[PDB]
Design a binder for this molecule. Structure first.
Ligand SMILES: [Mg+2]
Ligand SMILES: [Mg+2]
Lengths: 257, 256
DNA sequence: TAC
């Protein structure tokens, strides 16, 4: 069987809903949909948006109103849902969904943005570490893992149009890039890079200066899998033509027998 | 599907081979690669360089040793290959490959350089004309055409850092610039200019005075298509960060 | 910097 997973930072779920997100959803027909940056209060979202037919939905909102939050729609009944690493400061921000689908755990993570201050760069980097711990523990216990979402970092120079200009900016600091190196080094694989080695493949573009249409962007959204499981991924692609947010969606297809 | 074509004046194929050209090739994975200025004698090129796995290769060398020559690597063979306009003085210089891939003909042309003398400026301008005749005839017969390579001319002031300084130099003469106007006027489209209107977009830089790193260069390498076919090009870009020659590669992507 |  083929299983299709889509990840998308929607930059506010009401914003894209007004833009016809539900129509794109019914067109795309993923088995599981992972969303980052919901912003809205789940209980007071449109009923049509909470209960889309054929899917069970899960919302993990931040404590702060109108901020962060993630969500998962799934055709597959999950055998558990965990919403944190069990570390207070990392679990109150609405960044974490870990869903068990038997063949694999699926991590839907909105990784912190480090731009706004030095405090938040530290917080991001330490979130990186807590996530590595968590996924390693699950992986060593024998679970296959799929990790998707917005990492807020471009891995290599190939992953953003403007590498030199940003070597000093959060999202392309050598500290952040080393963590991804270390993460990969721990037995995890950047799925998109299994199939496509071309530059100019991006998932986020600045709203300012017509950047998307000039294709001056970054790859911030990844699907990762543990090494053992990699032979199950048939494809990993970028849905470049889907608009409505400063991020575009990314797809994963896995084959399971 | 999506088909990727790359055009690159390698300024001598041995020179860039030594510089790790084969490694860039395997990184980039074009469906078709078009190369201008081979210089070397095909039969005595490295076997690794002639027979790269996954590609058929075609070399069209000049009669003159160590001079000019063009080449095409292609994952999918063409059904025909023509190596000239059928005009003697234009066809002995290793400047011309016309490959038929059914959906389109692909012209891989190393256009002549007019700097060295008045004789060669005339030769270049008349080569321009013979090429216009040819592509027009193929286009009128209904074929879709992609033309790529080194035109040895910057079209407009936007296409070189130093326009006033060179209004008197071959490569930016008004005579050469008018021919590109007339060529476009004949129903052909400068693909790069469909997507990017910024200045400072160049494909060649002088080796002297750190010109590349000061970005004082020229756009001399183009992908052109006939008007009818233009809706099929998804993108046309310059691969600025690829080194090894005084020219950098340019890319085309088409959806068939 | 166009040799
Ligand atoms: Mg956002
Ligand atoms: Mg040269």
């Amino acid at each position: 069987a083929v299983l299709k997973i889509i990840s998308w930072n929607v930059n506010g779920l009401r914003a894209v809903h007004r833009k016809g997100f539900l129509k794109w959803f019914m067109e795309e027909k993923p088995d599981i949909l992972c969303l980052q940056e919901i912003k809205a209060a789940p209980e007071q979202l449109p009923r049509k948006l909470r209960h889309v037919e054929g899917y069970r939905s899960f919302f993990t909102p931040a404590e702060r109103k109108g901020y962060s939050g993630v969500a998962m729609y799934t055709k597959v009944p999950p055998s558990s849902l965990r919403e944190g690493f069990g570390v207070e400061r990392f679990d109150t921000e609405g960044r974490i969904q870990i869903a068990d689908f038997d063949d694999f755990l699926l991590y839907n993570i909105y990784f912190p943005n480090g731009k706004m201050s030095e405090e938040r760069l530290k917080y991001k980097l330490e979130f990186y570490d807590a996530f590595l711990e968590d996924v390693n523990r699950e992986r060593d216990s024998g679970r296959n893992v799929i990790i998707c979402g917005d990492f807020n970092t471009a891995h290599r120079e190939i992953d953003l149009a403007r590498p030199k200009e940003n070597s000093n900016v959060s999202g392309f600091l050598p500290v952040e890039r080393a963590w991804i190196d270390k993460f990969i080094e721990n037995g995890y694989v950047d799925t998109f890079r299994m199939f496509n080695s071309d530059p100019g493949q991006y998932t986020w573009w600045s709203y300012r200066t017509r950047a998307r249409e000039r294709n001056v962007g970054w790859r911030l959204d990844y699907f990762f899998v543990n090494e053992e499981f990699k032979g199950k991924v048939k494809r990993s692609w970028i849905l470049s033509d889907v608009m409505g947010s400063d991020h575009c969606p990314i797809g994963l297809e896995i084959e399971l027998l």
